[PDB]
Design an enzyme around this catalytic site. Structure first.
Site, mmCIF file in Angstrom:
data_model
loop_
_atom_site.group_PDB
_atom_site.id
_atom_site.type_symbol
_atom_site.label_atom_id
_atom_site.label_comp_id
_atom_site.label_asym_id
_atom_site.label_seq_id
_atom_site.Cartn_x
_atom_site.Cartn_y
_atom_site.Cartn_z
ATOM 1 N N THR A 162 0.863 -1.195 0.034
ATOM 2 C CA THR A 162 -0.136 0.010 0.016
ATOM 3 C C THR A 162 0.967 1.491 -0.086
ATOM 4 O O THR A 162 0.566 2.212 -0.605
ATOM 5 C CB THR A 162 -1.169 -0.090 1.227
ATOM 6 O OG1 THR A 162 -1.907 -1.036 1.184
ATOM 7 C CG2 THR A 162 -1.802 1.403 1.537
ATOM 8 N N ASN A 163 1.921 1.208 0.735
ATOM 9 C CA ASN A 163 3.079 2.253 0.615
ATOM 10 C C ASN A 163 3.551 2.721 -0.746
ATOM 11 O O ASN A 163 4.125 3.699 -0.851
ATOM 12 C CB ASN A 163 4.117 1.956 1.770
ATOM 13 C CG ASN A 163 3.672 2.030 3.214
ATOM 14 O OD1 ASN A 163 3.536 2.958 3.796
ATOM 15 N ND2 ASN A 163 3.244 0.767 3.678
ATOM 16 N N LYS A 199 -0.521 -11.256 6.272
ATOM 17 C CA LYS A 199 -0.230 -9.952 6.874
ATOM 18 C C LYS A 199 -1.151 -9.383 7.644
ATOM 19 O O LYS A 199 -2.328 -9.083 7.020
ATOM 20 C CB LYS A 199 0.408 -9.045 5.833
ATOM 21 C CG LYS A 199 0.738 -7.467 6.329
ATOM 22 C CD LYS A 199 1.394 -6.543 5.446
ATOM 23 C CE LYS A 199 1.451 -4.992 5.620
ATOM 24 N NZ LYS A 199 1.985 -4.208 4.633
#
Ligand code: CA
Ligand code: CL
Ligand code: CL
Ligand code: CL
Length: 305
Positions: free
Chosen positions: A50-51, A164
């Site tokens: 997402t980063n 995760k």
């Protein structure tokens, strides 16, 4: 060679560089940056997390980044590629692209367009079964997957090799450990600030945004824990958790720009680590805060690298 089941340790979800004049990937800088991160004590890279603003990328850009990651780190360093999308068709296309581009694992969001539980279950069943790469469940709540669904999905699907958890609890980790043996399945917390307790109950460790900024420091924290040197680990962890304060993506990119990207010898890192158009960069005041609050850990990182 990279194992079927992702190794416990510290993983970094790498940010993405953009040439702002043309709004295209800056692959030359990206390669320098990935290579620098892989050489700073990390266990592996998460590409297109997402980063990395993966959802702002075209399909082709996604594949170029994975290929660029593989070239930066060599054939023996683990790469986990984010592949999440809205339909099974899109997810399989991303997965196949990832496979061709050199990823070892794929990291898969549940389908969101808040969906129902037999829909989630059949999706993961279909994906694991069709995927040429081992699958890590990406739980980012958008629906939230409890221990029951994860265990169900994992027991039915030997090609599923981990999860995760973004907001991981000590309870959640423990429950998963009790049902899923570590040799077949790796639990990752998403929080560096969770990792104290995270690993003390047998997580496979951590996928930490902040390892973009100070990767040697974050790896040192892990290394001290695994050595049993728990006193200094917690003291350093404390400092690092303090420095991690500023959180989302625009602030993280800017911190990487002025710390790790500069350490990696990337010129004009701040322009290249703007969020992609049309999103705005951090305010001046947000930038000042980053420099003040992270200065101490920066000095520690200059000491360790
Ligand atoms: Ca130094
Ligand atoms: Cl390149
Ligand atoms: Cl420089
Ligand atoms: Cl440094």
């Amino acid at each position: 060679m990279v194992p079927r089941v992702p190794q416990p340790g510290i993983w970094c979800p790498a940010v993405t560089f953009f040439d702002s004049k043309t709004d295209t990937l800056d692959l030359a800088s990206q390669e320098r940056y990935y290579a620098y991160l892989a050489r700073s004590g990390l266990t592996g890279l998460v590409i297109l997390g997402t980063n990395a603003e993966a959802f702002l990328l075209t399909r082709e850009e996604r594949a170029q980044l994975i290929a660029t990651a593989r070239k930066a780190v060599g054939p023996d360093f683990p790469i986990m590629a984010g592949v999440g999308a809205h339909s099974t068709r899109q997810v399989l296309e991303h997965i196949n692209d990832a496979s061709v581009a050199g990823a070892n694992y794929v990291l898969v969001l549940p389908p969101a367009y808040a969906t129902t539980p037999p829909v989630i279950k059949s999706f993961f069943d279909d994906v694991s079964c069709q995927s040429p790469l081992p699958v890590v469940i990406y739980n980012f709540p958008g629906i939230d997957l409890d221990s029951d669904m994860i265990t169900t999905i994992a027991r039915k699907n030997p090609n599923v090799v981990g999860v995760k958890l973004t907001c991981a609890s000590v309870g959640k980790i423990t429950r998963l450990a009790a049902t899923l043996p570590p040799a077949a399945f790796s639990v990752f917390g998403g929080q560096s600030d969770f990792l104290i307790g995270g690993l003390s109950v047998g997580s496979a460790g951590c996928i930490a945004a902040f390892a973009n900024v100070f990767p040697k420091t974050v790896s040192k924290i892990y290394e001290l824990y695994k050595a049993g040197k728990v006193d200094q680990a917690m003291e350093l962890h404390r400092k690092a958790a303090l420095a991690e304060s500023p959180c989302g993506i625009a602030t993280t990119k800017y911190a990487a720009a002025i710390f790790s990207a500069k350490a990696a010898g990337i010129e004009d890192a701040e322009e290249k680590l703007r969020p992609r158009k049309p999103y705005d960069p951090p305010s001046e005041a947000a930038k000042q805060e980053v420099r003040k609050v992270m200065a101490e850990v920066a000095a520690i990182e200059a000491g360790l690298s």
